[PDB]
A paper describes a structure:
The sample with Pdr5 alone produced a map containing no nucleotide ligands, which we refer to as the apo-Pdr5 state. In the apo-Pdr5, the arch of the LD2 connecting the TMD1 and NBD2 is not as well defined in the map, and the short helix H17 could not be resolved.
Pdr5, a member of the extensive ABC transporter superfamily, is representative of a clinically relevant subgroup involved in pleiotropic drug resistance. In Pdr5, one of the NBS is catalytically active (NBS2), while the other (NBS1) is inactive due to multiple substitutions in crucial residues of all but one motif. Here, we present the molecular structure of Pdr5 solved with single particle cryo-EM, revealing details of an ATP-driven conformational cycle, which mechanically drives drug translocation through an amphipathic channel, and a clamping switch within a conserved linker loop that acts as a nucleotide sensor.
Residue numbers in the entry: 31 to 56, 92 to 165, 170 to 470, 496 to 796, 861 to 1166, 1178 to 1502
The structure:
Amino acid sequence: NYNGFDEHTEARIQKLARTLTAQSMQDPKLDPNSENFSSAAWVKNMAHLSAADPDFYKPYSLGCAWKNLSASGASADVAYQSTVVNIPYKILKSGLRKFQTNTFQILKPMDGCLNPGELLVVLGRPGSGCTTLLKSISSNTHGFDLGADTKISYSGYSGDDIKKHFRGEVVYNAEADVHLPHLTVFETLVTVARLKTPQNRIKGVDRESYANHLAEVAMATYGLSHTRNTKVGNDIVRGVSGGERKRVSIAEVSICGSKFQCWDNATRGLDSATALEFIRALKTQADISNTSATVAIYQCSQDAYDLFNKVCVLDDGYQIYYGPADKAKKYFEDMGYVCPSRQTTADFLTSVTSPSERTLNKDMLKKGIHIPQTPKEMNDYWVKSPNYKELMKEVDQRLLNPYTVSYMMQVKYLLIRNMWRLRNNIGFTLFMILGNCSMALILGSMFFKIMKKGDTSTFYFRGSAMFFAILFNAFSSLLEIFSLYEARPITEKHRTYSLYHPSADAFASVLSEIPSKLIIAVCFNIIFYFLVDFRRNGGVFFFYLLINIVAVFSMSHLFRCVGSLTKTLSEAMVPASMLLLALSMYTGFAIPKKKILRWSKWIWYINPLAYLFESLLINEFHGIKFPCAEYVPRGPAYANISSTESVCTVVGAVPGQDYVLGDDFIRGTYQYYHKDKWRGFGIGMAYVVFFFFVYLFLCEYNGLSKSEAIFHWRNLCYEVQIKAETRRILNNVDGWVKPGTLTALMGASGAGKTTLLDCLAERVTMGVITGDILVNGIPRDKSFPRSIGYCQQQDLHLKTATVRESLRFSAYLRQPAEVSIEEKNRYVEEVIKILEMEKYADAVVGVAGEGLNVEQRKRLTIGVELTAKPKLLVFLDEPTSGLDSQTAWSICQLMKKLANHGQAILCTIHQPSAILMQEFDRLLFMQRGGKTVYFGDLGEGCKTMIDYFESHGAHKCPADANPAEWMLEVVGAAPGSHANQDYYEVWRNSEEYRAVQSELDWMERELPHEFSQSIIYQTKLVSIRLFQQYWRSPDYLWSKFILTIFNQLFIGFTFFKAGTSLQGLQNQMLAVFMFTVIFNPILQQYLPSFVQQRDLYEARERPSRTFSWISFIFAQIFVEVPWNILAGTIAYFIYYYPIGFYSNASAAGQLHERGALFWLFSCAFYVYVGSMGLLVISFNQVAESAANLASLLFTMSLSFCGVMTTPSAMPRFWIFMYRVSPLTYFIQALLAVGVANVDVKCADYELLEFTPPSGMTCGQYMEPYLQLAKTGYLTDENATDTCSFCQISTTNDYLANVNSFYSERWRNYGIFICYIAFNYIAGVFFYWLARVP
């Protein structure tokens, strides 16, 4: 723990400075190695060194003065929920409003002044203008505006000045938690130290040594020298604890040299012991570096108050007082109020602003002197006060009169920072490397057999292999986007400091990743190029590798620009998906350049992958001769042939050749001419450089039912095994609760405050409880956990349901079944009134940022347990934890009211202020380890407990000390307590224990279907809720529908009426191939909803018995399907017709059946997508691991689909996979239903031509072949000089080669339905095994 620059820090700093001086070897008030050295002088001299550079105007120290400060904000107009149907009109009205006044006053006129070195604390209730004031005085005026009369002067330099020249000397920190988790503390501080050394004014020590020493000192001063090698961490990453983490921010901003500061919500979620240390460290900064700071805090302990110089009290956006810290209480007592005996000064100052907690001075009322009682009157009285007449003088007397290190080093140090990040989180990088190695080794094998021959039968596979290689190279980098969004908040923080250019951060992010790219592009490419058996020449292999490197760089730098514009990955999934489809579809292989329609050619002319693939193929085919495989006239009857009487079944063939010159094949099919070898590299570099610079530019510039059971427990014991076998956490605890009483349960950092609720509430999961808990003198049973409420300490609700819906849902599912839905509603009205929330019953629960504020959410969570008509206790857990004083008192009053009505309550409590304590009728206090110390009436003013403890030997209590902490100091439980005896034994022997035991003995003479609803009703209600939750989530549904209506329509139109030529049939097959790649975006969009609702269920709904898991999972299934079916129907309508399938359907006369079945497949595919996305998340904690697994399975299924490589060419092993994947059946059925039963039309360049033998027509020459094989047609039969031949007479002969059939469409449909069903069933089973206890 920390003591505020005690002798230890001085010793450590002297040691470090001695080390610095010794290492430098190549007045005595300053020298490490002399006598009477003083650390403060040394640290202050380093500070001045950092500040007073000869050629910098940076001021020595900044105060602040402000008179008539006035802030107003945009009007709070009415709002409404953004249902899926409302978001269009809402978008329209908002856009019109922005394209083409109404305001409100937030801060009424204020004055003030703050001097170098002082500390200012801005007190006030929530929503009283604290944040607005803090932002105003630091010139961060965004979201509002300052009135014209305002005037601010930072000790000489107007507000506009520091915006132009000294930003960095004025800081604002809404929160001190933003830190990059995976570095160590030293690695977090030393980089900032390096960035800030005045590089031109150090002598006799190298740059790095001075930076290391400055970081070491900056750790030592703020008591962090024991976390030198721990990760800073976050909520989910283990590291330094909360207080230490918040002190890291002060150390960082100390090195950064900010002279003025502001901290808005500084001490969130810090106990009284840690907030004090944080404030003390801030005081040390103000003491040493001569800064000045202002902190706005809630629950300011008296100890933390004594350190502050000045206090600013706010109310309803006014100013009540602003003067020295210790004179505030006297001024407020002279005002007319009286501070109760035990109330702390800060709580007193805050409470006076709340009508209910005040205590007027009766003497003044009796004599008839006006006492202000509303904030306006208080402001008037203050303005009339002499304190203001002094403050105006102290104001007027002040109001009457770029990056340290050059750009290259800003890049260098950030690059090293990124390398450290990688080294501390190396598992993420090895995942990528191993994944790409595995993908290469797998998808290479798939080609391993066919390629060996090298004949003209592998041309299509030589195309597909390049397709896979170029895609899996280009898109292997996108995993780096996560580390961009992770590091954006920290870069935004460091921008506020004049620390480094954002361009520098981006430039370092580009470079730091290069090693991973040039490891993957070597391993993957070597493996793949070896396996697929391309040309062995090294002089072409190196060019292939170069082209892949350029492709990966190009796409990496394009998607960095895409990820820069959008706020978060959730935003980027849609536009990134659309751009990915555009770039991967127009690569020049799915649709060859010859067949691209006019309206989309330009897309091919601006696609870098198109040119790179062109270069790859020109390289791979140019100037190499492939021997033939099969000539078009075949069979024994053709045993005699002249060279000119035969040709190859391939595009570029020439009659009389023993081979085909690959140059001619690429010319014939794709129109790539060998003179275009380097165009691809040239354009690739242009795109890389251009999009890199665009990336940099963008980053630079952008009534209640009574209780009836006297619940009591005796001899209760608790034991666990995890840390050690058979150790005891509750040791013979005993007590009771009587209806109509409010009992509290306090304990130290030791005793199980919580564990004694969970053992009682039957909510523990492990261990053994000994002894008996009794209800009416007989043990609890299976029915118990439905008769007790339990208000979690947290507040977690479905963010789309409104308060009345949240209440009524639980009312329905928890209350007994025999009450009609009419009565439960009047009971919900009872509950709404008794909690006094009738004004906002119809608000949206939302999240903390935009919705119900914390007090309202805690009122709600209590509401949800009353509405279940529990008959036994209503347990709570630390209801006041996290709440400021005023809302804590409000909740305490609510609990007292519920207790008065007749509802028993047993509530844990943590650090309650002295005023709250009186409200709890009883108490149960426990020591380190579950030993009970006290159990009895708390008495009036806590006298009864103080009497007991003082009677048995405890040191007396001060007349104004807080009892709730006094007793914590009486017996252990406090740092350095040293209790004078064991208070467990005194209780064991006391009279009170005898009375309690006698009562329980008399208590044992007092004695004289695990889910309320069925499964069907639970599923009905939960499904209705989940429907309301998809609805009211416009983002999900619309980013689903527009994504589909683009991807499908784009794919449909690019192949608009592809025809029925051989290339046409291949293009239609690929079109059915790109129909499916929409799997991943839709699955990833769907996943978060399930995660949200499952997290709510397993946390709150499961233990409380609200509904059974079966009903939850069936709600998921029964709701996700009706949306996917609609999406599939839309996709069918926009996809089936443009590409021309219906025209094929009419010819065969089967339009109705071939349309209905196609629609059924377009529905089944989306239902399958939903089911697969449910299965993969059934057994995963996180959405991202589920997305990873789903993408991997989809890639594996799609690669072996029999379309990228036909199953004949597949190696022997992988045949099994080609049979078990579902997409093979899907493609076989859909393509067949598309293009079956129609005649083929070979084009002008497809047709094979040659000469017939002399003295016979073409028909007679060819006819025997047209019997040895049973398909093909001749454009002419009476020709004599030459003929033209087309191997395929009907598409039903092409499909058979693709291994699809039109007679097997319904069977494939049946198998696909079977796969959907299996996915759902296995999802349910894996949920039952991986999550249900």
